[PDB]
């Protein structure tokens, strides 16, 4: 029951509501990272030696790793 209380309604407990707020924060962070990954400001063109393309910033990949770690734990 204590394990499943993390998937129950948030108002059904205090840990439930706290995990709900945390998962909301992490989902919003994931969505924001996606939307900023689709941007140009964070996709500067670079030269790779012979392929020319635009690469995503490392910060977005690190934040995505953090969020995926949280989601895989849940």
């Amino acid at each position: 029951p204590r394990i499943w209380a993390l998937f129950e309604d948030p108002y059904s407990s205090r840990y439930a509501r706290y995990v709900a707020f945390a998962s909301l924060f992490f989902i919003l962070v994931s969505i924001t990272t996606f939307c900023l990954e689709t941007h140009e400001r964070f996709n500067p063109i670079v030269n790779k030696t012979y392929y020319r393309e635009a690469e995503t910033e490392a910060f977005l990949t690190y934040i995505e790793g953090v969020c995926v770690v949280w989601f895989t734990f849940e």
């Binding site: 969505i31 996606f34 939307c35 689709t38 941007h39 140009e40 063109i45 635009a54």
Partner: protein, 86 residues
């Protein structure tokens, strides 16, 4: 309820139109999107609001058959999700 509906619709249709407009992207240009107004997703947010409210400024509009399908779906879903709580 109205603001939640609008946020969900805007996000979903922005992502959909951004990905649809890149199917017909020309391979020659180095940038991912050069001929389309939907160069990123926030522009998609703006277009999705303007299109769901049946405003239709015309500053940005889809120019690809997939983009046109997404735009028709966006207009219809906007009409519906606006006429729900109003």
């Amino acid at each position: 309820l109205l603001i939640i509906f609008l946020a969900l619709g805007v996000l979903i249709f922005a992502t959909m139109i951004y990905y649809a407009e890149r199917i017909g992207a020309q391979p020659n240009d180095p940038s991912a999107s050069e001929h389309t107004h939907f160069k990123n997703i926030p522009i998609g947010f703006w277009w999705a609001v303007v299109t769901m409210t049946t405003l239709g400024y015309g500053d940005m509009y889809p120019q690809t058959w997939s983009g046109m399908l997404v735009g028709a779906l966006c207009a219809l879903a906007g009409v519906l999700t606006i006429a729900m709580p109003v």
